[PDB]
Scaffold this active site. Structure first.
Site, PDB file in Angstrom:
ATOM      1  N   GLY A  92     -57.157  62.694  39.084  1.00 55.16           N
ATOM      2  CA  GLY A  92     -56.527  63.918  38.621  1.00 55.16           C
ATOM      3  C   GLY A  92     -56.106  63.860  37.165  1.00 55.16           C
ATOM      4  O   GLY A  92     -56.068  62.786  36.543  1.00 55.16           O
ATOM      5  N   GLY A 125     -51.041  63.145  32.408  1.00 56.13           N
ATOM      6  CA  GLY A 125     -52.102  62.335  31.813  1.00 56.13           C
ATOM      7  C   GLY A 125     -53.376  62.386  32.653  1.00 56.13           C
ATOM      8  O   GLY A 125     -53.621  63.375  33.339  1.00 56.13           O
ATOM      9  N   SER A 126     -54.194  61.337  32.574  1.00 56.37           N
ATOM     10  CA  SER A 126     -55.406  61.230  33.383  1.00 56.37           C
ATOM     11  C   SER A 126     -55.261  59.973  34.229  1.00 56.37           C
ATOM     12  O   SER A 126     -55.002  58.895  33.700  1.00 56.37           O
ATOM     13  CB  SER A 126     -56.646  61.158  32.501  1.00 56.37           C
ATOM     14  OG  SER A 126     -56.813  62.346  31.741  1.00 56.37           O
ATOM     15  N   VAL A 127     -55.407  60.121  35.542  1.00 60.59           N
ATOM     16  CA  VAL A 127     -55.226  59.024  36.480  1.00 60.59           C
ATOM     17  C   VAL A 127     -56.508  58.709  37.209  1.00 60.59           C
ATOM     18  O   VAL A 127     -57.109  59.599  37.798  1.00 60.59           O
ATOM     19  CB  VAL A 127     -54.181  59.383  37.537  1.00 60.59           C
ATOM     20  CG1 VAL A 127     -53.914  58.195  38.452  1.00 60.59           C
ATOM     21  CG2 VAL A 127     -52.896  59.830  36.873  1.00 60.59           C
ATOM     22  N   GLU A 177     -49.345  51.231  41.718  1.00 69.23           N
ATOM     23  CA  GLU A 177     -49.858  50.943  43.048  1.00 69.23           C
ATOM     24  C   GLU A 177     -50.552  52.190  43.598  1.00 69.23           C
ATOM     25  O   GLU A 177     -50.308  53.307  43.138  1.00 69.23           O
ATOM     26  CB  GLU A 177     -48.770  50.326  43.957  1.00 69.23           C
ATOM     27  CG  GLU A 177     -48.006  51.224  44.890  1.00 69.23           C
ATOM     28  CD  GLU A 177     -46.715  50.546  45.355  1.00 69.23           C
ATOM     29  OE1 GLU A 177     -46.782  49.437  45.952  1.00 69.23           O
ATOM     30  OE2 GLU A 177     -45.639  51.101  45.086  1.00 69.23           O
ATOM     31  N   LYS A 193     -53.300  55.093  34.963  1.00 72.83           N
ATOM     32  CA  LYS A 193     -52.863  56.311  34.302  1.00 72.83           C
ATOM     33  C   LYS A 193     -52.861  56.176  32.779  1.00 72.83           C
ATOM     34  O   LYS A 193     -52.153  55.331  32.218  1.00 72.83           O
ATOM     35  CB  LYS A 193     -51.462  56.647  34.803  1.00 72.83           C
ATOM     36  CG  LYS A 193     -50.796  57.819  34.158  1.00 72.83           C
ATOM     37  CD  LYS A 193     -49.371  57.920  34.676  1.00 72.83           C
ATOM     38  CE  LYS A 193     -48.857  59.334  34.675  1.00 72.83           C
ATOM     39  NZ  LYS A 193     -47.593  59.484  35.383  1.00 72.83           N
ATOM     40  N   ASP A 210     -38.273  66.120  38.262  1.00 73.02           N
ATOM     41  CA  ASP A 210     -39.461  66.898  38.596  1.00 73.02           C
ATOM     42  C   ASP A 210     -39.869  66.690  40.050  1.00 73.02           C
ATOM     43  O   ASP A 210     -41.035  66.576  40.357  1.00 73.02           O
ATOM     44  CB  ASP A 210     -40.592  66.540  37.627  1.00 73.02           C
ATOM     45  CG  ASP A 210     -41.707  67.568  37.595  1.00 73.02           C
ATOM     46  OD1 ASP A 210     -41.486  68.746  37.973  1.00 73.02           O
ATOM     47  OD2 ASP A 210     -42.846  67.266  37.187  1.00 73.02           O
ATOM     48  N   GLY A 248     -50.304  67.421  33.021  1.00 68.86           N
ATOM     49  CA  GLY A 248     -49.166  67.082  32.182  1.00 68.86           C
ATOM     50  C   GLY A 248     -48.754  65.625  32.315  1.00 68.86           C
ATOM     51  O   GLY A 248     -48.024  65.107  31.475  1.00 68.86           O
ATOM     52  N   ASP A 268     -51.495  63.819  48.342  1.00 69.48           N
ATOM     53  CA  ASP A 268     -50.217  64.304  47.855  1.00 69.48           C
ATOM     54  C   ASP A 268     -49.729  65.451  48.751  1.00 69.48           C
ATOM     55  O   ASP A 268     -50.524  66.088  49.442  1.00 69.48           O
ATOM     56  CB  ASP A 268     -50.234  64.588  46.343  1.00 69.48           C
ATOM     57  CG  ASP A 268     -50.938  65.877  45.958  1.00 69.48           C
ATOM     58  OD1 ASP A 268     -50.837  66.896  46.673  1.00 69.48           O
ATOM     59  OD2 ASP A 268     -51.582  65.962  44.890  1.00 69.48           O
TER      60      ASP A 268
END
Ligand SMILES: Cn1c(=O)c(O)c(O)c2ccccc21
Length: 274
Positions: free
Chosen positions: A13, A18-20, A89, A35, A135, A16, A96
């Protein structure tokens, strides 16, 4: 060191946070999430006990990392010229809470109770460690589908916990409290409880209660699904307009709706089909 230690897989994904990417620690084949966060897109910076310039996200993660599996643990991190790379991890299988609710809709109260209780335990751990997430929402909660254990992720909008007023916020607006909307001021614990009220409503109704600023400020909750009076009571308490009228974490966990929680493994066997 660098990228000999990890085998990079598919992108999981981006946003906001980042890129994981999915990854595997080459040393012991351990599942991990990698990430990447661009330096230019980082607003809040901090310092480690060591004394190095890192994203606040790294500071906060180190403070909450221990044996307790309720929060995602940071295993390592690297600095590149224009980015930071965080090794986290990764449960497997996982989904999710946002995707889970999209697929299954409103959750049965027994399931919502187990999940909500686990989120509360994770948030309490963060607060006990001097960290405020800022958040809390379904997108930031991972479900370990085999063990029925929930995990909090993305501390990139977080801050050190304090007893004074917060005048900054960069979390999700629809989960932000009325005092932030109207005055640009909130205190940590009470704002967290508000977002927990939004999350609980989300779990039992399949969607968040408010979309517009005016609805947040009015704070009127309408239930679109059949939800027990005890659950409705807890939700409305967490969503009190005045911060001081909201329950403490102790009050939430001692609420009649929260009694006789299932253990995570029982939760997976009954609702996730382990
Ligand atoms: C640790 N972690 C994150 O921080 C994140 O933002 C994700 O999207 C994610 C997705 C799957 C597994 C782990 C993950």
């Amino acid at each position: 060191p660098l990228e000999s230690q990890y085998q990079v897989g598919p992108l999981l994904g981006s946003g906001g946070f980042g890129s994981v990417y999915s990854g595997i620690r080459v040393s012991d084949n351990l599942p991990v999430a990698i990430k990447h966060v661009e330096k230019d897109r980082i607003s809040d910076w901090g310092e480690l006990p060591n004394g190095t310039r890192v994203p606040m996200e790294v500071v906060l993660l180190k403070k909450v990392s221990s044996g307790f599996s309720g929060v995602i643990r940071l295993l390592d991190w690297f600095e590149r010229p224009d980015s930071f790379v965080l090794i986290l991890e990764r449960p497997e299988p996982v989904q999710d809470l946002f995707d889970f609710i999209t697929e299954r809709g409103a959750l049965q109260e027994e399931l919502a109770r187990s999940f909500f209780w686990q989120v509360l335990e994770a948030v309490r751990h963060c607060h006990n460690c001097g960290v405020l997430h800022r958040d809390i929402k379904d997108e930031n909660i991972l479900i370990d589908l085999n063990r029925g254990e929930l995990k909090l992720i993305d501390f990139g909008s977080g801050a050190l916990l304090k007893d004074t007023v917060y005048t900054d916020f960069d979390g999700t607006r629809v989960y932000s409290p009325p005092e932030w909307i109207r005055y640009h001021r909130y205190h940590g614990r009470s704002a967290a409880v508000w977002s927990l009220g939004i999350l609980l409503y989300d779990m039992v109704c399949g969607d968040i209660p408010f979309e517009h600023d005016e609805e947040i400020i009015r704070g009127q909750v309408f239930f679109r699904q059949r939800v027990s009076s005890e659950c409705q009571h807890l939700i409305r308490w967490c969503l009190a307009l005045r911060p001081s009228d909201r329950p403490t974490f102790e009050e939430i966990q001692n609420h009649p709706w929260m009694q006789d929680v299932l253990l995570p493994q029982e939760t997976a066997e009954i609702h996730l089909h382990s």
